[PDB]
Design a protein around this nucleic acid. Sequence first.
RNA 1: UGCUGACAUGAGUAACGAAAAAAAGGUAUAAACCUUUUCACCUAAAACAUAAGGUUUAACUAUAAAAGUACGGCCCCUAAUUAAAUUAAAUAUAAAUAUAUUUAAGAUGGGAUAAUCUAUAUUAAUAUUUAUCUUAAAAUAUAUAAUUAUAUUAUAUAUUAUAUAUUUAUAUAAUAUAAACUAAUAAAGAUCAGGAAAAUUAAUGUAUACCGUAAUGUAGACCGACUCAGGUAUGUAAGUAGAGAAUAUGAAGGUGAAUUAGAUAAUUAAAGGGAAGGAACUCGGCAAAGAUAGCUCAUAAGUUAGUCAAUAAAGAGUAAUAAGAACAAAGUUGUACAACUGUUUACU
RNA 2: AUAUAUUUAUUAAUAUAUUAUCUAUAUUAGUUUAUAUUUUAAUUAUUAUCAUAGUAGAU
Lengths: 112, 46, 50, 65, 156, 206, 98, 113
Amino acid sequence: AVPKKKVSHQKKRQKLYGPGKKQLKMIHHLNKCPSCGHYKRANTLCMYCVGQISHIWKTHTAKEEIKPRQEEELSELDQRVLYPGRRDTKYTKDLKDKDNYLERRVRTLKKD
Amino acid sequence: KSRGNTYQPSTLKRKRTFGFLARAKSKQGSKILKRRKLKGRWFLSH
Amino acid sequence: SGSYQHLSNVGSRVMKRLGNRPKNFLPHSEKFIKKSTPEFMKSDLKEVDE
Amino acid sequence: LTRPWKKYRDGELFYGLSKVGNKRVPLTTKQGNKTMYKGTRASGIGRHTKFGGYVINWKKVRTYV
Amino acid sequence: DINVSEKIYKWTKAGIEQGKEHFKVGGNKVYFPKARIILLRPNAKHTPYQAKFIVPKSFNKLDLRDYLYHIYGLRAMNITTQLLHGKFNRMNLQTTRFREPQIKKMTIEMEEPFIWPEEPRPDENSFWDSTTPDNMEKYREERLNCLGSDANKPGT
Amino acid sequence: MKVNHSISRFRPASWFEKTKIIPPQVYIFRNLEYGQVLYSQFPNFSQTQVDKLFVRPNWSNRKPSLRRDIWKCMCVVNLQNYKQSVHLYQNLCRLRYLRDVAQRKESDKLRKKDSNGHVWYSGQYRPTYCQEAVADLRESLLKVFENAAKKPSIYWEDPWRMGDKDKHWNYDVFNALGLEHKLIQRVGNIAREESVILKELAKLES
Amino acid sequence: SPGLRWYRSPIYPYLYKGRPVRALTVVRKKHGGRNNSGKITVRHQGGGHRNRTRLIDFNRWEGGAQTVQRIEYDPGRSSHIALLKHNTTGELSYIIAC
Amino acid sequence: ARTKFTKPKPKQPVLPKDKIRPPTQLTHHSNNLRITEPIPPTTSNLRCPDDHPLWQFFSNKKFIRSADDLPPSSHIRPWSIPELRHKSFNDLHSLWYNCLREQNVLARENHLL
RNA sequence: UGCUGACAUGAGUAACGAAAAAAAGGUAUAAACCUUUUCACCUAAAACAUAAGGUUUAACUAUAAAAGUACGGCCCCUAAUUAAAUUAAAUAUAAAUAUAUUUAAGAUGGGAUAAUCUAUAUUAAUAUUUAUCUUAAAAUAUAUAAUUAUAUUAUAUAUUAUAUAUUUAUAUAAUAUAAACUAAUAAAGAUCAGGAAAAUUAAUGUAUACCGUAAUGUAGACCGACUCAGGUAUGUAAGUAGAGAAUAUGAAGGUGAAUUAGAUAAUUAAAGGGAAGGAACUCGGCAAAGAUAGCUCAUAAGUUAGUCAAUAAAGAGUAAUAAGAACAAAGUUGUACAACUGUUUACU
RNA sequence: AUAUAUUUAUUAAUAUAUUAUCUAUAUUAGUUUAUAUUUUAAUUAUUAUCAUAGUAGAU
Ligand SMILES: [Mg+2]
Ligand SMILES: [Mg+2]
Ligand SMILES: [Mg+2]
Ligand SMILES: [Mg+2]
Ligand SMILES: [Mg+2]
Ligand SMILES: [Mg+2]
Ligand SMILES: [Mg+2]
Ligand SMILES: [Mg+2]
Ligand SMILES: [Mg+2]
Ligand SMILES: [Mg+2]
Ligand SMILES: [Mg+2]
Ligand SMILES: [Mg+2]
Ligand SMILES: [Mg+2]
Ligand SMILES: [Mg+2]
Ligand SMILES: [Mg+2]
Ligand SMILES: [Mg+2]
Ligand SMILES: [Mg+2]
Ligand SMILES: [Mg+2]
Ligand SMILES: [Mg+2]
Ligand SMILES: [Mg+2]
Ligand SMILES: [Mg+2]
Ligand SMILES: [Mg+2]
Ligand SMILES: [Mg+2]
Ligand SMILES: [Mg+2]
Ligand SMILES: [Mg+2]
Ligand SMILES: [Mg+2]
Ligand SMILES: [Mg+2]
Ligand SMILES: [Mg+2]
Ligand SMILES: [Mg+2]
Ligand SMILES: [Mg+2]
Ligand SMILES: [Mg+2]
Ligand SMILES: [Mg+2]
Ligand SMILES: [Mg+2]
Ligand SMILES: [Mg+2]
Ligand SMILES: [Mg+2]
Ligand SMILES: [Mg+2]
Ligand SMILES: [Mg+2]
Ligand SMILES: [Mg+2]
Ligand SMILES: [Mg+2]
Ligand SMILES: [Zn+2]
């Protein structure tokens, strides 16, 4: 149930790193994407090219934003009177800074 | 019967028992207050 | 800020304690202030008391 | 998640920084029971009625001349 | 002859007609008042015919009305009072906690409307320009809360 | 005892004719807390009226409190006949129902949304409901006059509350009628002596 | 019920089946057998039914003929009490029933 | 509970066609009603006066006095006690109220800042 | 089993706290945030109103709007009770103090008027607990005033038509569902016999103070060291079903979560089914299994006479015959001990 | 009912597409249901969810 001794430096290290099962393997199965000449996984789509195509689809197949007439044709002063500004909470501010906590996809290296 | 929740707050009761004025009014409470003052306490009572 | 502290004198004792820091822990107090301030703001000379 | 930037369990609270603190700090108007009435030195103006109403006493009302 | 509310309304109308107070003036004459009031910007819930003030915590509704009449010449017809809560604040967790001040805010209704002047641009006014102090605050946060290898990390 | 008052039921034209408490008119009430509007046949109202209107409440359109202070008269609309006023009132109720239950999605689409796709608010005050009520009032009145002497009139709390006298409120039917957009006299505490003011208005057109 | 099996109480049909005169009744303050210390001095006394003590005339001073109007149940004593009415005076009073 | 054995209940006793009263209300809401877009209240209907007494809380109708709009520190001095001592009561009272007004203007601004 | 600090080891191991998720888009930044649609879960709640509590957590600083009527406090009044208070000498007492009496405080309670809307000030003058039956009345049908069977039976409002004051008032007549529920009324059964305390006319008044109001509240926002399957007061709690607040469903509302994706060995947990046998198991039928109406009938020995035994066991009617939702309902007996309903070692 | 087309002399008739089957008032306070009035406010085929895999018979 309980360790009888302080496990030594040797014995913890040979346990962890000695076996190949536990080690990380080289990703030999990279290959060139045909659409953009960059690294991608074998039997896998290029995340750049498919992303680009998805973006294209979004730009074309776009549901139009609903802008109400009455709010679109308000005067500036009138709009200010109706819908004044406010102090956002700390939480709200944190939520707003998305680049702080949201990871954008990195581009791979160009294949040789 | 699970224990641990022996504190059951109720502001009124707290102020009656452990409030400053209750301490002031009793002789014993006044002595306590004095003792706390001597010690240097920032908060003498609830 | 979103403070409201400026329209009152609340937590007065605490403010006094903070304001009147002991002089032998003045380096401690100002070390972090120095760190906080940018190079163009901060001055080398000692901020003497009133 | 309570907040999406904190995916894992840091020792951060659901709200605020610390739950604990000095309980012994003077009451305000907002605190206490329904019966707890603090008041704000605003109205020693008139007189409370026998029935629970109030009757202003204008000789004891502040004008700013 | 007539009911109380109606009588009050009649009195108010008479006072308006006069150009005298639209309300019974008190006897406790304060010659040198030290009270200041902070005229606030209007919320979405209010109209152009309303104005809200931060006032003294010991300021009465009647007192406020009197102040508005005599100091400024404005007659507040209806007045409400909103005493705010005082949330706990502390400089740091090593310090003692205490409440921020309970602050009294009184809305008034008035017979003529009013809309604030438009707030200035960043380039125009020196003081009303939140970029600088906010940036400074951010820099302070960075520098105090920077620990190890984030010292090398470039500034925002 | 007598349980029911004038307010306790819906009152048709015949009842009004029999009684004559007030003239032919409909009262409209802003909610200072939430910005919601409350129509009524009488200058007072009860929980029953609230229940009738606020039938499908949610977080956005919460069922309002009946506390008297937050309710304030937005608009008092007078008409040529009791029957006409009753019909207008019914139309308003119908419109409200449509907005809440039947044709809710369309109403939502029409409204102003903030970022994060909610109907724009400041606190729990939502300024769209009032606007809708003004638009709904305009619609109902128009319908009444299509269906169809004293010149009718709409006593406003506030002249600002009109969208625009050019863009709206200048239909041919209204003009033919002589729809006078008056406002209530603010020479007194409007909130506190509201009932008195309403009584005075009622007296004026009789 | 097995609790009913040994419940005997004497039936008095002549006994009054109404409330006592309210002017002659004071509240019967409970103690739980606790003295001014707040400590249980007398054991085995506690939360009964609510009661009113009845002000029954033991001295019997006034004199003159008095008619017994009714005979009542009294919760604070084993005896019945009799509501007398003074024939001349008209003053009302309680008395231990014979 | 509902069971295999539960026979259904009888239908409610309807009042006959002749006996039922005609309802007091006959003609209800218009079926033609339509959800129109809202009509947002406009400042154009207002006539905010140029001498509204609430402008007295501002200074030259400015949301905020800039550094140039403010009176400079070298040019300005507070009153001396001796100077005040030879002023009349009414004058002093007026001065006090002017001071208070100025504070209010600054207080509004200061708070905003 | 020294004290304090720092850092190891177990170990990148267990665990990430009852849980239903999917796609598209915000965004070529999202398992976790927002929106839309789909799907699910709670639904006499995981809903909607509130009480208490609390680092304001809120839809936020441009912030929780009250003269009063199905608005609370404050105020008046008092209960339980409390009081360095109160009375040459109230009484007692090593001091502290204690007692009795006064006065003052003290809500968990009582408190005038009101949609026809209503007016609270000042001065003067003399209600434990339970029940709404039976009878009687008239009404509706069958038979030949009287019988039989069936509901109805005190109050709550609009309409119409009359008679009196003069379209506003008063009274009368007639018209008009069922089932729950409310308040107010009346009469009244039982012993366990049911709070306290604070006047009326007239004249003159009344410019209506202060505080509470967010959100959370069977909970991530309180008490449990934690965003803890624990503890936490009250009122509504769509319909369909039913004796019902049981049980099923779920209109609306709210929610689908600081862990995910896969795989589903051994093994564990919590479930479902099982041939032939049927307690052979085991200390012991522990556990599991077992309900051939729940309504209406009927129901023994014994016995303290109490359908106590009884919700008797078996059994009948209605329903169903191959079965085909949930929930209520789980035998009979002998002996020892204790009359019985209760109480007990909060955590063996 | 709206929108888009075709015929007809904006109207009516036809075709296609989309949305809808609500609502309000009476029956003495409230709630539900019922009927009447009001309104365009529908009844057949086939699915799904939930109730221990809802239960049961096979597999
Ligand atoms: Mg503890
Ligand atoms: Mg609170
Ligand atoms: Mg009012
Ligand atoms: Mg004894
Ligand atoms: Mg050592
Ligand atoms: Mg791992
Ligand atoms: Mg493992
Ligand atoms: Mg291991
Ligand atoms: Mg694991
Ligand atoms: Mg979990
Ligand atoms: Mg996405
Ligand atoms: Mg239900
Ligand atoms: Mg919830
Ligand atoms: Mg809630
Ligand atoms: Mg609350
Ligand atoms: Mg208030
Ligand atoms: Mg009050
Ligand atoms: Mg008192
Ligand atoms: Mg008190
Ligand atoms: Mg109370
Ligand atoms: Mg609320
Ligand atoms: Mg806590
Ligand atoms: Mg614990
Ligand atoms: Mg929990
Ligand atoms: Mg249930
Ligand atoms: Mg649903
Ligand atoms: Mg078997
Ligand atoms: Mg078998
Ligand atoms: Mg055996
Ligand atoms: Mg064996
Ligand atoms: Mg068993
Ligand atoms: Mg026998
Ligand atoms: Mg069972
Ligand atoms: Mg026993
Ligand atoms: Mg126990
Ligand atoms: Mg135990
Ligand atoms: Mg009814
Ligand atoms: Mg239809
Ligand atoms: Mg379910
Ligand atoms: Zn590519």
